[PDB]
Each structure stands twice: as C-alpha cells, then as structure tokens.
C-alpha cells in the first residue's frame, strides 16, 4: 500500500517539524518583555466620521499619501474619501454590489474591488476624460474574492474562496502564478514591506507564507482552532499577527517559525474581523463582532485600550502609512478616524 | 470660512456626490431583494425561466414592484463566510424537488440544507417561499415507488394529495421559529403561470408585516 506508507511519512515529517520547533522554543516572548514598561492606557478620540454609505461597509484601504481612503460597501459603491476635509473625492458605481475587498494602488492611480462575482476589477482613477473607468476585469477564480493587494501598477495578488491565491499581470489580465496548498477558503492576505513575500490565512486554521516570484509555499503556521479572518505583517516583515473566529489573535515569527504570542481575554467571546499594527509595531489593533476594537500591547499581550463608537460589527481596520490615524469601518455604514 | 476657491469647489463636488448617493439609496430602497436557494438539479432554473462565474442576478418587474433575485448557485465555498451578506434580503426562495425522494437520500439532503438555512442566525426574521417542483413527475413515480423508502414512519396511501401534504408538513416542521418567520409553500410544475403571482403575494405579506412593525402596530 503506497498510500498508507505515504501517509506515515507525512506523519513522521510532521513530528520532525514539531520537534525542531520545540527545540527552538528555549524561552517565550512573555519572559523577555517582562522588564518592558507597559504602554499605559491609550485613549483615542474620533476625529472624523465618514457618512454616505447606505449599507454595510466591508473593506477599506488607506492610500500611501495618508489622506485618501477607498471604502467599499454592499450598496454597490466605492467611495474615495479625503480624510482631512471629509469631502468625497470619487464615487464609483460597481457592476456587482457583493463586494468583500478593496485595494488602493501604492501609486494612487488605481483601485481594486472584488467579491461574490469571482472577479477582481481594476478601476483607473486618473483619466483624460475626468471620470473613473474600469481598466480591467480579472477572471479566473472559481470562488469569491476575499482580499486583493497591489504590488505595483501592473501586478496584483488576490485570494479566493476556491482555496487558492493568484498573482496577476494587469496588462494581459492573466495569472502569472497560482499558490495552492490551503485546504479551506483563504480569507485575507498581507504583503511584506518589501513585497518579496506574503502570508495568507485560511479557514483551515492555517497561515501560509509564500514567495511571490518562485510561487511556492515556504512555511505553514498552525495553532488557531477556527477560521482565520485577518492577517498582517509586523512593520519589519519578520513576524505577522493573525486573528480568528475563536476570539484570539496570535503573533507568529517567521524566522523562529513558531507561535510567539497570544492575545485573548475571557470577556471576549466573539470573532475577530480585522487586525492592524502601529508604525512602531508596539500596538496591535483588532476589530471584533462585539462592535468595537481592542488595542493590545503586542509585546506584553495586555489590553491597552478600546475604540468603542460603532453600532455594529467592526468589519475593517486600517492604520495609515505615516502612523497618525486609525480608520474603522463597520456594518453600521460609517467610517471613523481616530487619534 | 477659511477655505480656498478650490476647496469650495471641492466641497461643492462632494455635495453633488451626496445628492446622487442619496438618489441611488432611495431607488435601492424601493427594491425587493430575493435570495434564490436550493439543492442542485432541482427546479431552480425552471423558476428562473418562468420569472423572466459567481452570483447570478435576475431583475424583473411585476405590478409596479421591481424584483432582484440572487442565485448563489455555482458558489462552491463555505456558506458561513458569505451568507451574512444576504442579511436583510426580503425573502428566501427555496426550491425542493418532489421527485427527489427516491434518488444519502437526496430529499434528506434538501431537508438538511433547508434546516441549516431556516434556523440560521442571519435569517431569524426572514420569510421563506418554498417551491416544491416537478409535481408531475412525482405524480408518476408515487405509483411505482412508495414514500416509505424515503420516510420510514409514513402510513399513508400512494396518492398525490396525502403524500404531498406529508412532504410539506415535514418541511414546515423544520421551522424552529414559527412565531417570527412565515413559510409560504407552493406546489408548482414545469408548466405554470402563477408562480410569479404567488411570490408577489408572499412579498406583499412580508412588506405589510414590515410596515406593521414600522407603524407601531407590532
């Protein structure tokens, strides 16, 4: 029986990986940050409130200039917002209203949008006609689009509920590499600061680290008991935090290859919808279905603060590239900016 | 006001965007949204053809009411991750084939799907329009194959009315929230004209109940 032998070899290989990881875990992060002063209490106030979406907000993404936002709602519209003045720069009618993700290109020229139509639409912001046009539709996924991130004006990574990720060349509209290996629906992506690597968490309770050019998985990270809904690299790109439906955040280190910290509380029993870091990486921000956001001390695992102020599930978060403000979106139809 | 001329034109463009987003939302608010659902190889396509790759949307108009139907078939992914997108649908049309009892048992799969949908936390107060399709083929088969093979405890004769009523009751007993949501059951065939009218009546009842909740009688 080749299959039985093959299953065995998988088992001893998994045991070897577990042993090599236990060998690496000489000390915990909680034992080294025990001499580090706590951040104290962090109070943040709403500074702006963004009104105009007439349905649940599913995704938002800051621009790299730290003023403009793209926000996606089930009302079938993207809104590009000026965060300083609250003015709406653009309103983009979507061909399909069942959007789940939105991306803003780092150059600022394009926005990506996708969802239950299994398509990633690229909208050109800067046209001679003075309107926003659909520049391309990327088809080829057989499950819904759950996340998308630009690497450049011509390359985008998407993740799908068909268990796979894809890297697309935008000019030709073709997949240049497909990333397979998750056995459940892939929920979220995060790109490394240098965009050579990216992590994806899926509904198999697993996060995989992928090399973009080679197109193959480098590492697999386990430990969550339920679906992973959110994932995010640490600022330097040597760690990432994941958030799941089991009411837990977990910080993983790429070079150590283990789980490094757990962020949970007995008073929290709801799923985690979104996670984000601060510029220094000292704060981990998470949005919950309890209708608020928690600010964790990412090195001491303490709860440092709370962002309350939403009437529904905090569906999405975003920390701005220059670090001044936090944005929260929600199923209550409103975006809020916090300082 | 300490705004530039260009700032004031930017604010004026933002307010125009406000107006149109309000017009779009008002137009959306007059719309009846239907979640079309059911097992594969059922009369779902028959229903769609009588009314008129991810989500498929169908739009039709009947008696000054505009209807949007969302076929979420061809989405082979975990339902729990996108079903909450349809929280706020006015009604769920659910297609079950009556001819599927003698084909695990396929009708039992339809019951499992119905049970998972009706008692979902996102559809607590969402009504269900249940279509039992292919009653003509069910008429033919009920002679050769009894309903006992599908239902061990059935104690009735091989007649359309009694077996059909048994199936309907079997489906309506899966409702664990009978005091919050109605189940409208219709017995339709391949060649019918009254399906749209039945959906219209059920949606009118749902609208009337929502208006009762708004006006304060409920």
């Amino acid at each position: 029986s080749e299959l039985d032998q093959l299953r065995q070899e998988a088992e001893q290989l998994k045991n070897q990986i577990r042993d090599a990881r236990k060998a690496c875990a000489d000390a915990t992060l909680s034992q080294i940050t025990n001499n580090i002063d706590p951040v104290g209490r962090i109070q943040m106030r709403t500074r702006r409130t963004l009104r105009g979406h007439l349905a649940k907000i599913y995704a938002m993404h800051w621009g790299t200039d730290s003023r403009l936002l793209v926000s996606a709602s089930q009302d079938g519209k993207l809104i590009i917002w000026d965060s300083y003045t609250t003015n709406k720069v653009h309103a983009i009618p979507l061909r399909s209203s069942w959007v789940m993700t939105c991306a803003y290109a780092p150059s600022g020229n394009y926005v990506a949008c996708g969802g239950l139509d299994n398509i990633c639409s690229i909208y050109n912001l800067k046209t001679r006609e003075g309107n926003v046009r659909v520049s391309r539709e990327l088809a080829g996924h057989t499950g819904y689009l759950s996340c998308c991130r630009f690497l450049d004006d011509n390359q985008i990574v998407t993740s799908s509920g068909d268990t796979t990720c894809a890297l697309w060349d935008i000019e030709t509209g073709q997949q240049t590499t497909t990333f397979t290996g998750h056995t459940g629906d892939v929920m979220s992506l995060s790109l490394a600061p240098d965009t050579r690597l990216f992590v994806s968490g899926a509904c198999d309770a697993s996060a995989k680290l992928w090399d973009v050019r080679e197109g193959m998985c480098r590492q697999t990270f386990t430990g969550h008991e339920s679906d992973i809904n959110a994932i995010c690299f640490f600022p330097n790109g040597n760690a990432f935090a994941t958030g799941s439906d089991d009411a837990t955040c977990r910080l993983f280190d790429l070079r150590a290859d283990q789980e490094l910290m757990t962020y949970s509380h007995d008073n929290i029993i709801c799923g985690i919808t979104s996670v984000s870091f601060s510029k220094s990486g000292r704060l981990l921000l998470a949005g919950y279905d309890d209708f608020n956001c928690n600010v964790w001390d990412a090195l001491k695992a303490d709860r440092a603060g709370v962002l309350a102020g939403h009437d529904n599930r905090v569906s999405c978060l975003g920390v701005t590239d220059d670090g001044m403000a936090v944005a929260t979106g929600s199923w209550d139809s409103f975006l809020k900016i916090w300082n | 006001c300490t705004l530039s001329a260009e700032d004031k034109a930017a604010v004026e463009r933002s307010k125009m965007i406000d107006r149109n987003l309000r017009e779009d939302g008002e137009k959306a608010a007059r719309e009846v949204k239907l979640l079309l659902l059911g097992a594969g190889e059922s009369g779902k396509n028959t229903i769609v053809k009588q009314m008129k790759t991810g989500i498929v949307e169908t739009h039709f108009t009947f008696k000054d009411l505009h209807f949007k139907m969302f076929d979420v078939g061809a989405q082979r992914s975990e339902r729990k991750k996108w079903i909450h997108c349809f929280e706020g649908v006015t009604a769920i049309i659910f297609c079950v084939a009556l001819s599927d009892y003698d084909l695990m048992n396929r009708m039992h799969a339809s019951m499992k799907l119905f049970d998972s949908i009706c008692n979902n936390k996102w559809f607590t107060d969402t009504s269900i329009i249940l279509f039992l399709n292919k009653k003509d083929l069910f008429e033919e088969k009920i002679k050769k194959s009894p309903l006992t093979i599908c239902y061990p405890e059935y104690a009735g004769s091989n007649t359309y009315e009694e077996a059909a009523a048994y199936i309907q009751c079997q489906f309506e007993d899966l409702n664990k929230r009978k005091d919050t949501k109605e189940i409208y059951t219709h017995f339709t065939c391949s060649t019918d004209t009254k399906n749209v009218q039945f959906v219209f009546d059920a949606v009118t009842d749902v609208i009337i109940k929502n208006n009762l909740k708004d006006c304060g009688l409920f």
Partner: single-chain antibody
Amino acid sequence: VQLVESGGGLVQPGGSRKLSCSASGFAFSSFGMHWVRQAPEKGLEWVAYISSGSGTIYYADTVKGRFTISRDDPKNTLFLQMTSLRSEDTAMYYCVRSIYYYGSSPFDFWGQGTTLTVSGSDIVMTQATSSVPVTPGESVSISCRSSKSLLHSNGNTYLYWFLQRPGQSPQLLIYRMSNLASGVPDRFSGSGSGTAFTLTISRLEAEDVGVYYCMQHLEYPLTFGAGTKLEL
C-alpha cells in the same frame, strides 16, 4: 478631448452676440467651465466661470451685468450671452475646462477660441519682463510676483503656469506650484516662496518658445500675469 468654440465675427457696438462651446470626448457634466479672453495684442484675462452643476457662477467686474454664462449639459454645450458690446470686448475667446477635488489639475484643457471684433482688491501679478532672448540647450528662469502671498493655510500655493505657442491656445505647465502637468516634459520646473515665483526650463528646445503666463487661483477674479515672451 475637444472644446470647439463657435460664434464670433464682426458685431456693432451696443449689440449682442452668443458664443457656443461644444465639448466632446470627456465627462462634461463633471467639469467646471471658464471663459477667458485675449485682446488682439494683450495678455489673457479671465472673463466668467460656471461650476459643475451650475451651482456657482462668477464674472469679472468688467463684464458683470452685460455678460451671461450658461451650460446645457445634455447637449454638451456652454453658452455666453453678450449684450451692450464695447470696443474693449474685441478679443479671442477661449473656453477652458476645470475640475476641482483633492489632487486634481485645473485649467488643463483650452479650446481653440473664436475671434469677436467690435466696430481694487484684485490680486495683481506682475511679470517684470516682456522678452527673454534665448538659445537652445540653455537654462531659463522666468519670474512672477504677487501683491499678496498665494500660500494658504492648506499648504497650497495657488500659482498656475501657462505656455502659449505662436498661433495656438495656452497649455498648462505647472498647476499647483511645483506640480508638473500631464504630458509636459520634465524640463519644466516650478518653485517659489509666498509672493516670488520662478519657472525653470532646462535643456531648452525650439518648441519651448512662446509666451509664459503666471495665474493665481486663491479667489475670484482670477488674474493672469502680463506674460514673458521667449525669442529665437
């Protein structure tokens, strides 16, 4: 993108004439539209402005009460009604598109214009030079000055630079001071401090010869500079 002006010709003093501007190739409803005149030998002068959606309308003090601006958005045309025409109204009229939002570039497309022949608190901007003899390949520095600082609490300095080539309509070069316009070579650059403004041209070409105009967009009326002409 095309803006084609129509009307014009010879008109008697005290009469009336209607100028039309047919827009094609862009989202006309989304754009504010200006009318700017150029006298037969003088520089540019802003005449009228109608915003997107007709919400706001501005006129110059020298035409208020005699001139009217309207837009028929469905038929894609802008109209100017002129009454009590004077001798000072003899000019070539340019229809200019403008769009306003964070990061946009106003005054970016100019029409071809039509010729009409008739038988105190304003910000004044001076280009203290009228001609600059130059040769290809060298650097050039043109200057403008403002009566009041064009810098705003926004951090925006509202200084536009325009180039008019011989027998042509003006072209936007630098829109908000130091921002290069679309399709403009990098040879051009802009700098300034509040009231003193410089346009720098590197590796000069034969195409770059023309008249350069500084404009302000702090408040209305919009004021153009006198213009500096480049020779050879």
